[PDB]
Scaffold this motif. Sequence first.
Motif, short mmCIF file in Angstrom:
data_model
loop_
_atom_site.label_atom_id
_atom_site.label_comp_id
_atom_site.label_asym_id
_atom_site.label_seq_id
_atom_site.Cartn_x
_atom_site.Cartn_y
_atom_site.Cartn_z
N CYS A 54 0.63 -1.47 -0.59
CA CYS A 54 -0.11 -0.02 0.05
C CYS A 54 1.38 0.88 0.04
CB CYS A 54 -0.87 -0.25 1.27
SG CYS A 54 -2.00 1.41 1.54
N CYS A 57 -0.87 3.36 3.61
CA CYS A 57 -0.15 3.18 4.50
C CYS A 57 1.76 2.51 5.07
CB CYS A 57 -0.71 2.32 5.63
SG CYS A 57 -1.97 1.05 5.01
N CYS A 66 -5.92 -2.47 -0.60
CA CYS A 66 -5.56 -2.34 1.03
C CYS A 66 -6.49 -3.14 1.90
CB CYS A 66 -4.63 -1.57 1.40
SG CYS A 66 -3.65 -1.86 3.21
N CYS A 69 -6.63 -0.11 4.60
CA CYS A 69 -6.76 1.50 5.03
C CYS A 69 -8.04 1.45 3.47
CB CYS A 69 -5.71 2.55 4.42
SG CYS A 69 -5.01 2.50 3.41
#
Length: 400
Positions: A54, A57, A66, A69
């Motif tokens: 990701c 994050c 992801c 998030c």
Amino acid sequence: SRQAEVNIGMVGHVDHGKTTLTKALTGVWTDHSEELRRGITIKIGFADAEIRRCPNCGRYSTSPVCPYCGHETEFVRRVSFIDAPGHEALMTTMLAGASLMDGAILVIAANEPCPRPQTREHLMALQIIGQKNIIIAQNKIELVDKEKALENYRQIKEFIEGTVAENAPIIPISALHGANIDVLVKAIEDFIPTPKRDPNKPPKMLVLRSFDVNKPGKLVGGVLDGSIVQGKLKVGDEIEIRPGVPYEEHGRIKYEPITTEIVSLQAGGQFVEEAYPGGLVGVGTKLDPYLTKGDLMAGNVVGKPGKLPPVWDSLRLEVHLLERVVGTEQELKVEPIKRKEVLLLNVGTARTMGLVTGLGKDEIEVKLQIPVCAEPGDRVAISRQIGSRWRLIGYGIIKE
Ligand SMILES: [Zn+2]
């Protein structure tokens, strides 16, 4: 290429989370006509997964989205998880086809105190083949408390001391809740990196299956599915296959190496112009489909003309008998190999019965029912028919 780069063995009890973990890693949740692609000599199966990271994050996962998030992830690397049905098959696969594994995830249940018998044998196999790119998954942590979990951890550290797994990370995970899965995926990147393979070495592929894909009854040549363990393959390449096609001569059966050409290659779920080690590779050839139909070439070895290992009608094996802990009372006392015994032998993806025709110091001579293509020094799993089932009792090293 976007094909798998490493094969990762899922080494663990037929249900200590392995299935739930493998699926958590591959993202497969629909009930799997991939079982029809599984090996029939060694029962090896492949399940690819794309490792992504990701951008938002920075956490790793195997999803385009992801899980933490919800942002779009970036591609990192494709890998393939390999497994076998049950303990015996997995053990046989590791001893006969170590070259098919680039690393392994050893699954140990936190739910259980001391190392289970099968888990002991799993590490014994990894030790024998020298596989050190290991990751330990302490699964089922959502079932035990903060204390028994830490105790199990100590036990695992003791268990791995002095073994090929001594430096392996121990990752507490809950495949059910998805906790720490990101830690495990990152560990795959850090502890099982793609090896620095010399792509120019003579190509070698171990054939797992062979088919006749021509629609039920343009007609395409025979197809071979297998693992490239050295070098690379490319559309247009001329290849030789050993032992080859069987034929009768003076009331005897012999095999003739056969040459053909690569018309197509399939890997990672797409047709490519070049294929490499990692994952299953489908090779389309100009061969007469009658010659590959019904797995006629399973167990054969593929390479470029004049650059393949030799073919053997008999083998002299340096024998190492296993000190097993899995099995009934006296199933654990492996009786010495005697002349005239008919043993089951697995080398690479090749399988054949062998008649013991001679004995030597920690050595046996076996006449093979079917010739095998292999190099001196290659490892061969040895099984004995006890009662009426085949049981792994050791392994042999091909002597010249
Ligand atoms: Zn994220």
